[PDB]
Design an enzyme around this catalytic site. Sequence first.
Site, PDB file in Angstrom:
ATOM      1  N   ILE A 186       0.877  -1.154   0.000  1.00 54.23           N
ATOM      2  CA  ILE A 186       0.000   0.000   0.000  1.00 54.23           C
ATOM      3  C   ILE A 186       0.923   1.214   0.000  1.00 54.23           C
ATOM      4  CG2 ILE A 186      -1.449   1.261   1.707  1.00 54.23           C
ATOM      5  CD1 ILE A 186      -1.992  -2.341   0.524  1.00 54.23           C
ATOM      6  N   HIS A 187       0.916   1.963  -1.115  1.00 60.23           N
ATOM      7  CA  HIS A 187       1.876   3.017  -1.424  1.00 60.23           C
ATOM      8  C   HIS A 187       1.205   4.393  -1.423  1.00 60.23           C
ATOM      9  CE1 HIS A 187       4.530   0.095  -4.003  1.00 60.23           C
ATOM     10  NE2 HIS A 187       3.467  -0.606  -3.661  1.00 60.23           N
ATOM     11  N   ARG A 188      -0.093   4.450  -1.764  1.00 58.16           N
ATOM     12  CA  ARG A 188      -0.688   5.717  -2.178  1.00 58.16           C
ATOM     13  C   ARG A 188      -1.303   6.499  -1.020  1.00 58.16           C
ATOM     14  NH1 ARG A 188      -1.208   6.325  -7.707  1.00 58.16           N
ATOM     15  NH2 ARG A 188      -2.308   8.259  -7.185  1.00 58.16           N
ATOM     16  N   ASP A 195      -2.190  -0.921  -4.169  1.00 56.23           N
ATOM     17  CA  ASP A 195      -2.711   0.264  -4.837  1.00 56.23           C
ATOM     18  C   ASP A 195      -1.700   0.827  -5.849  1.00 56.23           C
ATOM     19  OD1 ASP A 195      -2.282   2.550  -1.949  1.00 56.23           O
ATOM     20  OD2 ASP A 195      -0.889   1.199  -3.022  1.00 56.23           O
TER      21      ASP A 195
END
Lengths: 359, 361
Positions: B207-209, B283
């Site tokens: 999960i990056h965003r 994401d």
Amino acid sequence: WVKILSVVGARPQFIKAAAVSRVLRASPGVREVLVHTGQHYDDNMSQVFFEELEIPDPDYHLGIGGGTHGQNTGRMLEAIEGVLLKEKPDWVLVYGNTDSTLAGALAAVKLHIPVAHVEAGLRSFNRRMPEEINRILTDHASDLLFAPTETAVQNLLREGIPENRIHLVGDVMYDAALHYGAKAERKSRILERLGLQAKGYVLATIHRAENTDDQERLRVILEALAEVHQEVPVVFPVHPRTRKRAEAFGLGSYLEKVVALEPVGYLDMVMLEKNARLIVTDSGGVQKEAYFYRVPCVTVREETEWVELLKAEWNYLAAPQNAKDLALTILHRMRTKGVEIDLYGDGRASQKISDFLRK
Amino acid sequence: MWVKILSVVGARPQFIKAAAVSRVLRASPGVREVLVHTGQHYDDNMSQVFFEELEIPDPDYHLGIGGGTHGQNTGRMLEAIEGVLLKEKPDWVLVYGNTDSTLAGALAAVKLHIPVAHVEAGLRSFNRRMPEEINRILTDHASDLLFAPTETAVQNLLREGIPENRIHLVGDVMYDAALHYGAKAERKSRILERLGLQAKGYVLATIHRAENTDDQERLRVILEALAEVHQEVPVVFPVHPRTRKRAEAFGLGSYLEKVVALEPVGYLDMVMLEKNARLIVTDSGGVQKEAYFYRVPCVTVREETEWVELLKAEWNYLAAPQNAKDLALTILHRMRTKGVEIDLYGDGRASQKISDFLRKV
Ligand SMILES: [Cl-]
Ligand code: NA
């Protein structure tokens, strides 16, 4: 209600921007900013240009120029963007198809400032022709495309630009020629000085390398003009380079056989063009001006970018192979006219542009 | 005789694409290569690991430009790239992806009359206010050769008047790269042994965003869902120390306890985890593609992806994080699905096809 920022580099662009401005400044609720990408010029001849052509004083002169495409474009991009972040215009107008034009459009578009391209959709179809890349990328960068011709419209459609961003408005240079034409008639003494009557002379300009750098073509031209002069006076504002080449080739004396002048200022040149019986030229810009003033034109080239003028019978190619034939060609085209129809709008392209802007 | 082929790169994905092309170019007689990076050399640990693990050559030039506005970065890159092109006098310039670097490279070259080939040409979101859309368009219209990843991209180019003879459907070199790094990961990565995991015996989450990490409702949904999945099947979650503290702050740290939460791993260890996962939850647009390349079902925790073709081939599935129960179920259900057996992005030899076209002309 709306802030409209114009980016201009070269003089043709100042003339287009001035025409649009003549409409915009009459519009209450428009604020205008004029960004020149190059330098101020204090020389007399330059000051006269800005003054006699009623060019607005720029709000900025970015001072950029003299470099490669990459230096000039890249520095303009950064510098124009700086101005856009301060001025925060609702519209950016870019004109023509130089590196200034492209830098303006690319600066604006990445800030999501709507860009309108004045003089959009022109194509040589030669990706190496000087301005072809600037034409294509400015058009694909812009939000509004103001095309001068139906051919330009189709050019834009062919490249997937949607119809609702394209508006056929004509050429603002026609608007400008009508404006300066009226002013020249009021102000210019050039016909009084030379003792010439309206429609009583031929105007010649020659400056392309294809003609001036070839001893033989230049002899043919100068001899042809000397022969035309005997029938109808020939006014020849000689480009300094053309003069230099003539002299080096031992062709100087032929210039004594016509009305040879030093180049004249802009309004004097308008006065000569509009009052000529015929224009002989190798200049692309002069070919258009001849048409704008409904004066027949002979183009001393083997081609022209403006094929529409040939089709409409306003312009006529005459390659300089033989002095007699060229002279006779000119004498004969003197009594022709082309199709009385409008190729580049009705001289009100400026109002049509404003209308899409003031929305 | 020989061709000089100069590549411009400005972001890590471009380095990867150019290296894939270069692995072919350097085996091929009659090529000299020059690599120009618009940005800086780095000496931090994670950067060194990038260059070493992913077999990325040090550029011949680092222009040291970055961190400014579009106009600043682009304008400086345009002048600086041109300087290098005047010195190097290449026969071809290759630009990659669709960033300001890409456009700066294309525009520097085209005004010198140096042929430009665009790797990854013809992508369109059809929204001229999406980040890279203007870049895609202008690079495409500035280029002499267009190396398209999809038939869709080919049609996009034809629809903007670019003639068929300058458009070559080659596929996505990122696929080539994923196969290269996949093989290397299987040879070298020990991360499954280290974690006591079995291939296809776990779910990988990344999960990056910001839309997720920074909104406490959405982040809770994700971590609550993962902790639920974890009761049936181990969830491996390499979490940035940022995102970890963002989660601790929102009060969600017990959830990271439940799953196998890790500090960031290296690139080949991530590749190893991706390709051997039962399912990937992410994401990231890039990870969604890697999932597809490795034929691992993907669940994307966003309301949109650009890569709609992955949705339509059923390799990926949108599950925007609004409901933890339903997100956990979607993961558990999709981990026993597969997509349509179809190649979307070429055959994994896009690099060979580019090289063959360049060496020909
Ligand atoms: Cl111009
Ligand atoms: Na008419």
